[PDB]
Structures are given as structure tokens and as C-alpha cells.
Design an enzyme around this catalytic site. Structure first.
Site, PDB file in Angstrom:
ATOM      1  N   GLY A  22      14.359 -11.117   8.724  1.00 28.02           N
ATOM      2  CA  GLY A  22      15.198 -11.957   7.881  1.00 28.02           C
ATOM      3  C   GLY A  22      14.983 -13.433   8.053  1.00 28.02           C
ATOM      4  O   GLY A  22      14.006 -13.865   8.666  1.00 28.02           O
ATOM      5  N   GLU A  23      15.873 -14.202   7.466  1.00 27.58           N
ATOM      6  CA  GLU A  23      15.824 -15.650   7.506  1.00 27.58           C
ATOM      7  C   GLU A  23      16.895 -16.158   8.438  1.00 27.58           C
ATOM      8  O   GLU A  23      18.058 -15.758   8.330  1.00 27.58           O
ATOM      9  CB  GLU A  23      16.062 -16.222   6.101  1.00 27.58           C
ATOM     10  N   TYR A  26      15.866 -21.529  11.175  1.00 30.07           N
ATOM     11  CA  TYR A  26      14.557 -22.190  11.402  1.00 30.07           C
ATOM     12  C   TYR A  26      13.484 -21.692  10.425  1.00 30.07           C
ATOM     13  O   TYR A  26      12.411 -22.289  10.305  1.00 30.07           O
ATOM     14  CB  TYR A  26      14.102 -21.979  12.886  1.00 30.07           C
ATOM     15  N   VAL A  29      11.923 -14.696  10.394  1.00 31.17           N
ATOM     16  CA  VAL A  29      11.852 -14.001  11.675  1.00 31.17           C
ATOM     17  C   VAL A  29      11.342 -12.599  11.396  1.00 31.17           C
ATOM     18  O   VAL A  29      11.791 -11.954  10.445  1.00 31.17           O
ATOM     19  CB  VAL A  29      13.239 -13.952  12.372  1.00 31.17           C
ATOM     20  N   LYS A  44      10.056 -15.850  15.757  1.00 35.71           N
ATOM     21  CA  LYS A  44      10.599 -16.758  14.752  1.00 35.71           C
ATOM     22  C   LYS A  44       9.516 -17.786  14.447  1.00 35.71           C
ATOM     23  O   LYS A  44       9.004 -18.401  15.375  1.00 35.71           O
ATOM     24  CB  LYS A  44      11.806 -17.539  15.309  1.00 35.71           C
ATOM     25  N   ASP A 139      27.931 -24.480  18.277  1.00 35.04           N
ATOM     26  CA  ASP A 139      27.825 -23.681  17.046  1.00 35.04           C
ATOM     27  C   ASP A 139      28.018 -22.207  17.373  1.00 35.04           C
ATOM     28  O   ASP A 139      27.320 -21.326  16.859  1.00 35.04           O
ATOM     29  CB  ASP A 139      26.587 -23.970  16.195  1.00 35.04           C
TER      30      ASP A 139
END
Ligand SMILES: CNC(=O)c1ccccc1Nc1cc(NC2CCOCC2)ncc1Cl
Length: 339
Positions: A22-23, A26, A29, A44, A139
Site C-alpha cells: 500500500g501507500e 513516504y 510499500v 518502503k 503523531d
């Protein structure tokens, strides 16, 4: 080189048999087979060099993850990049392959109290180590908590992290902030730059609430809506908590609101363990100076089956105007050990 979903993923020959995952924040991945360790891993791909801000975030992620060594913090196993700065256009970070993340689990799975307790323990154990290095994650949220097949939890993404700076924490009312809205402490919107450890404890409190119900506790739609949600459950701040806010615009905004009463945790979460709710209350405390700290949270009765300070290690040593060309050089130097 192998290509994935219309893009180069130049990781060979050590890593083969690529599959899109997936995304992330950054970029793409994938999973891949590591021909040396004989296991599948995550890789990644990061392409940050055209932008100073992307360079700053990538350097922080790499510098922090390579210095930290803790069971509840994702490690960097390897870093792939070209042999020269001139040829380096991308960097690939190799990490242990995880089965899922807490965001995905909360969307479809009900957590047992035993899983909630275990997950919270592991988040706080990793957070103790981060805070002991004088670092703030800034975060924490379910999608940054990855889990393997045996529910070992890893804190991820240190791209927004900072060294704690309590003396320079004060700022004006409604000062812009980068970290994820639903997990932002009330003081961010009032008078805080998010440079104290208490910012992370609030986010952990939000994640605990979300584990108890499978829904975010403060799902604000925009910047000031976030504070409306927090005050809608906590109720109006006390005179003593207002006295701690010297900034006139922030204090006056709070004084202008109609009185709101506290929604009890036991009514919001009727099936929750009472000790979990007592700890939740201490983490979701409006006044950041009265908010529980990570080591106190570990010692709370809810976590007594796991608490063992001798097995909750700390960091051996604690821890913005540079142009992107200087940051690229620092990233090249930080990744040199894997060549
Ligand atoms: C902080 N988030 C990320 O680093 C990330 C974001 C989007 C996609 C993949 C991601 N990484 C990983 C993903 C996995 N495995 C997946 C986890 C989600 O469920 C599918 C497997 N293993 C290790 C890693 Cl490092």
C-alpha cells in the site's frame, strides 16, 4: 529491476518476489523475500530529494529509527540506495513485515479486554523509551501502530518527531499544527506548540478510547471542531485549569462558551474494565501539567499483570534551515553503514 504498480522498486538481488502492500506517508510499500534471512520483509520506497521538507522528515525518520533499539519500536533492518550521492534518487527502508496495523484492526475486529490491556502496555513501554531519549513522537495514532501475527506491537513513523523543549512550548491561540487532528491534545489549539511529553500521552488516551469502542472518541471535522469534541466529553475546564492558560485570546475563548458538564466514562463505555477507565481519565486530563506521565501510566493498576520497570528499558543516551542539498548529504551519510 522488478516493477510494482507502474513504478521502479530497485531492491535486488537480495530482495525478490515483490508484492504491493500500500501507500504510506513516504510513498509505496511492498513486501519482498529476503534471500539472506529467508523471510518476507517490508520495503518502503522514499523519493524525497526535490523538496527540503521531504528531506527533513526522511532524515528524522532514519536518524531516530537507527539510534533507537526497542522491542516496541519498529527497527530498520537495511537501507538500499545508490553508491554515490549523484546517483541516489530514492532510498529503500527495509523493516520487519507486520501482519496488520491497529487502524485496520479497529475497523473490523472487536478487541478483548486482554488485547486492549496488552496493546496499551506495549504502546506505553515503547513510549517510555522514546520519552527517555527526550524525544516526542507527535503523531501517535492507530495507523502508526503495527502488529505481527502474535500481536507484538511496534510504534512507527518518527517523521514528525522532535526533541522535547518545555521552555519554548507556549504560543498563541489557534496556531497551525501538523499532527493528526483526532489525536491532538486540547492545548495545541489553545497555547501549545506540542513540545512537551504530555502531547503524546493525550494521543495514547485517544487510542485507548478507540480500542474500547472501535470508534474515535474525538472525531473533529476541522481545526477548532476538534476542541468542541474534546470539551463535549470532558466538559468545561475548571477555574484552576483556566488560570494555567495566561494567553487572553485562548482563555477568553474558553470563558465565552456555555457551561458543559462531563460525560462519564462508564456511560460512554459500559462494557469497559473500571481500571481501564480510571487510567483513560488520567490520560485524557485537560490540564497538561496534571496529565499522567508515561512511567506513572505503566504503574497504573490496569497494567499490573505486565508492569515490571526492570523490563521497561530506557535509552542509553538522549537526543530546519539546511537546504535540501545539505539534507541529501546527511541522508547519504546516515545510510552509509548498510553499504
Ligand atoms: C507506519 N506505516 C507504514 O510504515 C506503512 C504504511 C502503509 C503501508 C505499509 C506500511 N508499512 C509496513 C506494513 C507492513 N505490513 C502491512 C500492515 C498493514 O496490513 C497489511 C500488512 N509491515 C511492515 C511495514 Cl514497515
Amino acid at each position: 529491476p522488478e516493477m510494482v504498480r507502474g513504478q521502479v522498486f530497485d531492491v535486488g538481488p537480495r530482495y525478490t518476489n515483490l508484492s504491493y502492500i500500500g501507500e504510506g506517508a513516504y510513498g509505496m510499500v511492498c513486501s519482498a523475500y529476503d534471500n539472506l534471512n529467508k523471510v518476507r520483509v517490508a520495503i518502503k520506497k522514499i523519493s524525497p530529494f526535490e523538496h527540503q521538507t521531504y528531506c527533513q522528515r526522511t532524515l528524522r525518520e532514519i536518524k531516530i529509527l537507527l539510534r533507537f533499539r526497542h522491542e516496541n519500536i519498529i527497527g530498520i533492518n537495511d537501507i538500499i540506495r545508490a553508491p554515490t550521492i549523484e546517483q541516489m534518487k530514492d532510498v529503500y527502508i527495509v523493516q520487519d513485515l507486520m501482519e496488520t496495523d491497529l487502524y485496520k484492526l479497529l475497523k473490523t475486529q472487536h478487541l478483548s479486554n486482554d488485547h486492549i490491556c496488552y496493546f496499551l502496555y506495549q504502546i506505553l513501554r515503547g513510549l517510555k523509551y522514546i520519552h527517555s531519549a527526550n524525544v516526542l513522537h507527535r503523531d501517535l495514532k492507530p495507523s502508526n501502530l503495527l502488529l505481527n501475527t502474535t500481536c507484538d506491537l511496534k510504534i512507527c513513523d518518527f517523521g514528525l518527531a522532535r526533541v522535547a523543549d518545555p521552555d519554548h512550548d507556549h504560543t498563541g491561540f489557534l496556531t497551525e499544527y501538523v499532527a493528526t487532528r483526532w489525536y491532538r491534545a486540547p492545548e495545541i489549539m489553545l497555547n501549545s506548540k506540542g513540545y512537551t511529553k504530555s502531547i503524546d500521552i493525550w494521543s495514547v488516551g485517544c487510542i485507548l478510547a478507540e480500542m474500547l469502542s472501535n470508534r474515535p472518541i474525538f472525531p473533529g471535522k476541522h481545526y477548532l471542531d476538534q476542541l468542541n469534541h474534546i470539551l463535549g466529553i470532558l466538559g468545561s475546564p475548571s477555574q484552576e485549569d483556566l488560570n494555567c492558560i495566561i494567553n487572553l485570546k485562548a482563555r477568553n475563548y474558553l470563558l465565552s462558551l456555555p457551561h458543559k458538564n462531563k460525560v462519564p466514562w462508564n456511560r460512554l463505555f459500559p462494557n469497559a474494565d473500571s481500571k481501564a477507565l480510571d487510567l483513560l481519565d488520567k490520560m485524557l486530563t485537560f490540564n497538561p501539567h496534571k496529565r499522567i506521565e508515561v512511567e506513572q501510566a505503566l504503574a497504573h493498576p490496569y497494567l499490573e499483570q505486565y508492569y515490571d520497570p526492570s523490563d521497561e528499558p530506557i535509552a542509553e543516551a538522549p537526543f530546519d534551515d539546511l537546504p535540501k542539498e545539505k539534507l541529501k548529504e546527511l541522508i547519504f551519510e546516515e545510510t552509509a553503514r548498510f553499504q
